[PDB]
Amino acid sequence: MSLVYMNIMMAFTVSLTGLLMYRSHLMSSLLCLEGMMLSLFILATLMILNSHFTLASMMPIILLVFAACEAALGLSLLVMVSNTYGTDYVQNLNLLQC
Amino acid sequence: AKTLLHQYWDIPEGTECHRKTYAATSIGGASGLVVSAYSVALKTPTSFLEGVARTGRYTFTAAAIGAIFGLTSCISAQVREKPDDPLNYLIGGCAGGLTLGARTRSYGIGAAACAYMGLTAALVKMGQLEGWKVFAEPKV
Amino acid sequence: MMTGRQARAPLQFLPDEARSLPPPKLTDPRLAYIGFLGYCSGLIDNAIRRRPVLSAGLHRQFLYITSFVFVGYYLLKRQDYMYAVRDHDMFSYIKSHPEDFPEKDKKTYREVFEEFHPVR
Amino acid sequence: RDHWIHVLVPVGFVFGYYLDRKNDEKLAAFRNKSLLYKRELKPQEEVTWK
Amino acid sequence: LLDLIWLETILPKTISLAQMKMSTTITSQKGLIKLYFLSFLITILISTTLLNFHE
Amino acid sequence: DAPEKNYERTMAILQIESEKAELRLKELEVRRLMRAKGDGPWFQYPTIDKALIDHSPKATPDN
Amino acid sequence: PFFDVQKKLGVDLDHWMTIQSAEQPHRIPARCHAFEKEWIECAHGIGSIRAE
Amino acid sequence: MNPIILIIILMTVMLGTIIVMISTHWLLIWIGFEMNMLAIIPIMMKKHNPRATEASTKYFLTQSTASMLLMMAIIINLMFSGQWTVMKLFNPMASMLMTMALAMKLGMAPFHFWVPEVTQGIPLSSGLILLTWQKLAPMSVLYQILPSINLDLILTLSILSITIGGWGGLNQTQLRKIMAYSSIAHMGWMTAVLLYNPTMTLLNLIIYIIMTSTMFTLFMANSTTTTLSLSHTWNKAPIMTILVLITLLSMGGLPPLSGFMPKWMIIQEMTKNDSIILPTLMAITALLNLYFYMRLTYSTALTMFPSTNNMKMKWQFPTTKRMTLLPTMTVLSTMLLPLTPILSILE
Amino acid sequence: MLKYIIPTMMLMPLTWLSKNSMIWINTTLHSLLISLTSLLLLNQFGDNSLNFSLTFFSDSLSTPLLILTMWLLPLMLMASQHHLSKENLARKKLFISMLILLQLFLIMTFTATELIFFYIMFEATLVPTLIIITRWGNQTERLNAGLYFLFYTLAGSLPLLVALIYIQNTMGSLNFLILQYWVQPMPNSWSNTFMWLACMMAFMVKMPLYGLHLWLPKAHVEAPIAGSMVLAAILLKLGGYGMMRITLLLNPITDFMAYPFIMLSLWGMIMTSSICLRQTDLKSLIAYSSVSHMALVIVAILIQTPWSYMGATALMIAHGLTSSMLFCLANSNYERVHSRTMILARGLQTLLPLMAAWWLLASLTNLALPPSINLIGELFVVMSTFSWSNITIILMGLNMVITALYSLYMLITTQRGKHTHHINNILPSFTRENALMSLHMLPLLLLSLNPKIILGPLY
C-alpha cells in the first residue's frame, strides 16, 4: 500500500511503545497517548480524503473531539495526583499493591 | 515460534539426533527468553548486568532442559528402535526434570520436575500419535 | 448459532409463529419450580430483614410468587420456541441435503461380526 | 387439626405415588403392543394395565 | 512412612506447595504502572513476532 | 407392578431415549455441515445490506 | 448482544456513514463506488461464510 | 455527590454501553466506549481519597490505551474494507488489535494487571459496576466479530486468564481483590467458548453477573471489605453467612448450584468440537477459584471467628440498607440448575 | 422414585415446622416410615430392571443401597441427637436438613437412569457432607479434612465430567438402558487409556483406592457421628455403584487396565489392615478397616466376573451396616471418655456387659464370621479372585488373618483387661445407644436368612 501510511502507522507504534514504557511523569504518558490519537487522526484523514468518502469527513473531527475530551479528563486525573504528592510521578501511584 | 515446533516434529524419531537436539535447544531458548522478558518486566533488576544475568540464567536453564530432553529422547528411541513410543519421551522428560533440578541445585525439585515433565512429554507424544487437539478448530 | 434466523425480525421476544406452538400449561412443573423460587425469595427477604419468615408480608411473598411465575411463563414460551426453531431448521436442512444424510442399511446381528473378548 | 404435621410425609408419599401412576399413562406407548405380551382384549376391558 | 508421609507427600502436599508458590509469584507485584505497561509491551511483541497472532 | 406393565413401560422409555439419541447425533452432524458450508439458516453472519446503496445519477458519470 | 434497535424501530442512527456507496451530499461518488456496490450486491443476504 | 448528577452520570454509563450494543458503525462503538469510561470515572472517585484517584488513573490509562488500539483496528478495517459495518474484520492485524483492545477492556490476562488494583481502590458499588456492567459492551463487540477472531489468540487469553485468576486469589485477604481475580478467571471461561458457541458465552456472562452482584450486594449489606471483617458476620447477622456460603459454593461451580451451569455447558460445547485436553485443564484450574472460595466459607459460615465487645451495640440496630434484589439474586445464583435448558432464550 | 423423593423433601417442612422438643421424634418416626416404604423397591425381575420413568430406574444393585440409604437416616438421627442436645435450635434444624438433603441426593444418585444426572447427584452429595464435617465436627482438623475430602473427589471427578459428556456426544446418550444395548468395544489406544482413567478414577477416590485413601482417615475421623455413618456406610459405595455402572462401557480395555489397580488393592488390603494393628485412634482404626474392606470391592469390580459382582454388592451392604455400627460403638465410648484413644478406656465389659456383647457381635461380623453376609461377600470375592489367579488366595488368606487380628484386638483393648482406674464417668448404656446397636445388628443378622436380596443384578 501507500508509502505515507507506513510512516503514520510507524508513528502510531512509536507513540504506542512510548506509552507502553513509562519513565517517570504521568504527563509524558498523556503526551504519548495524544500522539497516538494524532496519528489516528492523520491516518483516518488521509484514507477518507484518498477514497473520496464524503460522509466520513466528519469522522476525524469526532475522533478529535471525544478524545480531546478524554484528554481533559486525563489532565484532571493528573492534577488530582499532583494535588496529592506534589508531583505527577507514577511511582507514587503504588498504594494498590496491598 | 510456530515453525520451531514444526521443525522439531518434522524429523522422525531416533533418526537425526543432532538437529532434534538443536531444535529442542532452540525451543527451550525461546521459552527461556520469554520467561526472562516477563521476569525483568514484572520484577525490576537492580542493574543492567543483573538483568542480563537473570536473562542468561533462565535462557541457559531452559535451553539445557530442551537439549537434554531431545538428546535423551532420541538416544532412547535409537537404542530401543521404537520411534512411536511415549516411554522415550517419558525418559526424556525425566532427564529434563533432572536437568532443571541440577540448575536449581536441588533434588526434590529434580524429582518433581522429572515426574511431571515426564508425564507431560508422554502426553505430548500421545497427542502427536492419536491427534489430540488443544487449540481445536470449531467444527459444530 | 441461530443468529441469522432471528435477524430478519430483530428483537422479537416471541415471534408470530411462536403462537403456532402449544403454550406451557399453568400446571407446568418448570413453572411450579419457578413459583417455588419466588417463594424462597420471599422467605429470604423476610430472613434478611429479620421478619417472621413464614408470617410477615404475605402480600409481599405473594407478589414474589406472582412475579416469578409471570416472568417464567414467558421465559418458558421462548425456551419452547427456540427448541422448536432448532428442530425445524434441523429437519429442513436434512430434507434439503440428502447427499449428506444417507439412509444407512441396518444389518441384523446374524451378519454383524463382533470380536469376542472373554472375561477369565 | 391438632396433629397436622404428622401427615406431611404420608400425603407426600401418596401424592408422589399418585404422580408415579400418572407418569405410567405417559409411558403407555407399547401397552398391549409388545411381541411378548400382545393379546386380544377380554370383554369388559379397555386397557391391559393402568 | 507410606500413609502418613509418602502417599501424603506426592499427591496433596507437593501440589499444595506448588499452588502456594505460583500464588506468591503471581501476586508479588509492586503496584507500579510502569512495569505493568512494560509487561503489556512484551505481551504485544511476543504476540506479533514470537507467536504470529496477526498473520 | 405387573411384568407386563414394567416391560412395556420400559419399551416406551427405550423408544423415547433412542429417538432422542438419534436426534442428538443428527444435531451434531447438522451443526458440522452448516458451519462448514454456511448454506443453512444457522451461522448466518451478516453482510452489508444492499438497501443502503444509492442508485441515483451521481455528480460524475463513471461509477 | 447486538440488540438491533435501529431495525426494530425503523430509525437510521448510523447506517448512512457505514458504506461509501450510500447516499452522499451532492451525490458525490466515492472513488470505489462501483466496486463496493458490486461486492455488496454479490454478498447481500447469503451470509458471511458463503460470501467469503 | 448530588443525586441528580449521580443519576445522570449512571444513565450516561448505561447509555455508553447501549450505544456499543445497538450501533452498526465502528465510530459509534468507539464513541460508546469513550462515553462509558468518561462517565464511569466519577463513580470510581465517589469518596475522594488517594486510593480512588490512583485506581481511576490506572483505569483511565488502561481503558484509554484499549480505546486507541480499538480505533487503530477500526482504521485498519477501513483500509482493507473501505466501510464501517460492525461485523467481521477484513484483516487479521485489525482482528488481533481489536482482540487485544477488548481483552484490555475486559481485563483479561495478561492485561489483567489493572483489575485487582482498581477494584481495591474504589468502593464496593463502583466495583460492582466495574465487574458486572463494564463487561457487557466488550463482550458484545466480541460477540459480533467472532468470524474474524483468531482461535489461538483468544484461547491463549482464555487459559491465561483462567490460570492467573486462579493463582491470584489464593494469596488474598481483601474481598475486592478476591472478586477481581474471580472476574479474571470467569472472563477466561467466557472467551474460551466464544468461537465454539457464543450462546454459552452469554449464559456464563449472565450467571456470572448474577453471582457477582449477589456477592457485592452481600458485601455492601454487611459493610465488609476484608475476610476478617466478613468473619464477624455470624455474630451480627447469621443469615448472611448462609447466603455467602451458598453463593461462594455456587461461584466455585459445585453442583447442584447455578454456577455449575455455565462451565459444564462450556465443557459440553468444547467436546463437541473435539477439544478434550483444553476443557479438562480449564476445569482442573477452576479448583483454585473453588479453593479460595472455600477459604472464605471457612472464615465466614462454617466456623465462628471471635468477635469484639462493641458488636453487642450493633445487635440493637437492624440493617436499614436497601438490599436491592438480594433475595432474588440469592435464589437465582443458587437454585437455577433444574432450569438449565432455559439457555435457549439466549440463542 | 417420586414416591421416595417427595417424602424425603417433605421431611424439610416436617423438621422446620416441628415444636422444639419434637424435631427429633417426628423426623425419626417419618424417616422410619420412609424406610418401611423402601421395601417396595424389591419388585425385581430375573430379566428386567424396575424401570420407573425416563429419569429413574432401579435394578437389584441399587435396591439394597436404597434400602440401606433410607434406613441409615433414622439411625443417624438417633446417633446425633445426644451430642447436639446443647445445640442452638436453628442449627439443630440445619443439621437435620443437611442429613435430609444428603439422603435426597443419594436416593436419586442410585436411581439415576442417565449418567450425567448420576454425576450431578454424585457430586451434589459433597455439599451436605462437607458442611456437616466442617461445621459439626469436633476438633480443629475438620477444616483441613473437609478440604482433602473435597479436593480429592473433585480432582478425580472433573475428568469424569468430560468423559461422560464425550460418551454423550459419541453414543448420543448416557441412558444406562440405551448403553446396555449400544455399547461398543473400547479398543486398545492411548485415547481409550485416558478414557478409562477418566471414567474410573473418581470412583477410585470414592471407594477409596489405596494410595488415594488419604482423605478418609481424616474425613471419617474429623466428622460427627452421623457424618461418619453416612460416609462409611453409603458414600464409599457410590464408588462401587459407579464402577458397576461404568465398566459396561469400558470393555475390553479394562481386561488389561485393571492390572495396576488390582495390585494397589491386593497389596493395599494387606497394608491398611496391618495399619489397623497399630492404630491408637479407634475411629482411625475403623477408617483403615473401611479402606481394607473396600479394596476387595475394587478387586471384585475390576475382575468383572458374576461371583465377584455378587460378592462385591453383598460386601458393600454388609460393610455399610458393620462399619456404621463400629463408628456408633466408638462414639458410645467417646461420649463418656471424650477421647478417641483406644488404650485409654479398657476393661469395659466389667462395666458395660450388654454393650460389650454389641462390640463382640460387631467385631465378629467385622472378621467375616459365617454365615453373615460379611462372610458371604468376602467368600465370593475370594472365589472369584481364585478363578482370576490361583495365587491371590495368599493375599486373600493373609488378609483374612489380619482382619481377624485387628477385629479382636479392638475387642481386647476396649472391652477386656483391667479397667482404667482414674476414669469414673462411665455411665450405664442408655436405651438410645443399645437401640442404635440393635438397629444396626439385627438387620445385618436377619439378612443371613435371605441373602438373595443383597446379591445384586446377576443373582
Ligand SMILES: CCCCCCCCCCCCCCCCCC(=O)OC[C@H](COP(=O)([O-])OCC[N+](C)(C)C)OC(=O)CCCCCCCCCCCCCCCCC
Ligand atoms: C484423583 C486425581 C487424579 C485424577 C485422574 C483422572 C484420570 C487421569 C487422566 C485424565 C485425563 C483427562 C481426562 C480425559 C478424558 C478423556 C475423554 C476422551 O475423549 O478421551 C479421548 C481423547 C482422544 O481425542 P478424540 O477422541 O477427540 O479424538 C478422535 C479419536 N481419534 C483418537 C481416533 C482421532 O483424548 C484426548 O483428547 C486427551 C486425553 C488425555 C488428556 C490429558 C490432559 C490431562 C492431564 C492429566 C490430568 C490428570 C488429573 C488432573 C488433576 C490432578 C490432581 C489435582
